[PDB]
């Protein structure tokens, strides 16, 4: 199968630099042009750069010309995006993608990487506070993930054993920090007789928290 595994996103101050990586497998890498496409917080797709099969020709969006540098290691099947003098307007989810057709000029993208998030902010990394939500047929439990920065956090229930009946809500900004919540709905016979734990991860702060929902 074709896989585009990205890595390297994170928080960076305005004016700083950051290098994204895109590891490719499952196709003849040297026979395809590669591209970077970013998506803004309002879900707006935006082509950033494209590099030819051998790297001799690069093309850049005008907004990034002279600040970002595309490069590829055809021996290691790896695509790189070196970003420098970063501005807040560069904050976005960054995708690598394979320019389809193997020809001169732009084209469509069939294979996309999973995306890595780049946050350009002077705010400091802050771990979340995770609080259990317990009630004072089916029973709804929750946990509150409050006051973290930057995005993202990942919330699971019983380490992914509880997938159905889960609602993890998008984060909102409050006092320059993010807060989200997640609910899980289980049968009455499950809780509280069994154990329901919400697992919260905040990779930017290396935070890994499990909160068991205990009755009131």
């Amino acid at each position: 199968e074709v896989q585009l595994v990205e890595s390297g996103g994170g928080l960076v101050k305005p004016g700083g630099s950051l290098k994204l990586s895109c590891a490719a497998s499952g196709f003849t890498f040297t026979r395809y042009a590669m591209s970077w496409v970013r998506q803004t917080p309002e879900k707006r797709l935006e082509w950033v750069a494209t590099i030819s099969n051998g790297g001799s020709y690069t093309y850049y969006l005008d907004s990034v010309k002279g600040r970002f540098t595309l490069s590829r290691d055809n021996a290691k099947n790896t695509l790189y995006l070196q970003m420098s003098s970063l501005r807040s307007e560069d904050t976005a989810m960054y995708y690598c993608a394979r320019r389809e057709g193997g020809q001169a000029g732009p084209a469509w993208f069939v294979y996309w990487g999973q995306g890595t998030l780049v946050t350009v902010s002077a705010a400091k990394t802050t771990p979340p506070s995770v609080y259990p939500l317990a009630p004072g047929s089916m029973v709804t439990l929750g946990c509150l993930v409050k006051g973290y920065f930057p995005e993202p956090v990942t919330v699971t229930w019983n380490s992914g054993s509880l997938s159905s009946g889960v609602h993890t809500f998008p984060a909102v900004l409050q006092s320059d920090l993010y807060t989200l919540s997640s609910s899980v709905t289980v049968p009455s016979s499950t809780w509280p007789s069994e154990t329901v734990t919400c697992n919260v991860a905040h990779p930017a702060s290396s935070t890994k928290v499990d909160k068991k929902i205990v009755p009131r």
């Binding site: 469509w108 709804t140 609910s183």
Partner: protein, 219 residues
């Protein structure tokens, strides 16, 4: 810089019915040397990368179900879903590759229609952990309702409270086509301790009958 305009911004249709999404460009994308249009369609579901559905205006990517049809020429293009399924909930983007820079449209969100459904409302007192640190978040879930319009009201000891409320909506559920909403009332510990009853109310404009869930700090 070719401008890709997608109309409308959102589309609502029932399961099994036909969806038609429009995309307007600024220049002809047809190449008269091989008679092909330089347009592509992408489907992006919540939390996922965009996925190519149609390239060259009407060529369907290997693996895309037959219900996705692309059509158009010049500056007006169409993505047709002959019968919308529950999984087809997504944001659909068009993209031109006629001239650098490749540009995308703002996207058209596909919403599914279904029968009205009242929210399942749950209210949660602040945890003792948060109270020890001086905080008091009162959380209310309004889960699996339809349609999307729903207004939450908070009352403290019977009086409405509007400050300190933050709301969050999920994307439409790809199984039952419902929406869910989270409403957090963030108070200080001191103010939370100064009152007893906290009430979360789910209302909608078409009715005067809310759905109410409350608790008492003392009992």
């Amino acid at each position: 810089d070719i401008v890709m305009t997608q109309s409308p911004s959102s589309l609502a249709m029932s399961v099994g019915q036909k969806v038609t999404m429009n995309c307007k460009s600024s220049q002809s994308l047809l190449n008269s040397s091989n008679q092909k249009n330089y347009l592509a369609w992408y489907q992006q579901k919540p939390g996922q990368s965009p996925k190519l559905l149609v390239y060259f205006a009407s060529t369907r990517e290997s693996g895309v179900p037959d219900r996705f049809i692309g059509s158009g020429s010049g500056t007006d293009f169409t993505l047709t879903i002959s019968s919308a399924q529950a999984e087809d909930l997504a944001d659909y983007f068009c993209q031109q590759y006629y001239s650098t820079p490749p540009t995308f449209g703002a996207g058209t969100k596909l919403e599914l229609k279904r029968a009205d459904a009242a929210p399942t409302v749950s209210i949660f007192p602040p945890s003792s952990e948060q109270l020890t640190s001086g905080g008091a978040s009162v959380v209310c879930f309004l889960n699996n309702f339809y349609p999307k319009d729903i207004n939450v009201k908070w009352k403290i000891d019977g009086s409405e409270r509007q400050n300190g409320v933050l709301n969050s909506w999920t994307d439409q559920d790809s199984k039952d086509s419902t929406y869910s909403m989270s409403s957090t009332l963030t108070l200080t510990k001191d103010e939370y301790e100064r009152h007893n009853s906290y009430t979360c109310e789910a209302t909608h404009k078409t009715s005067t009958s809310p759905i109410v869930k409350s608790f008492n700090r003392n009992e």
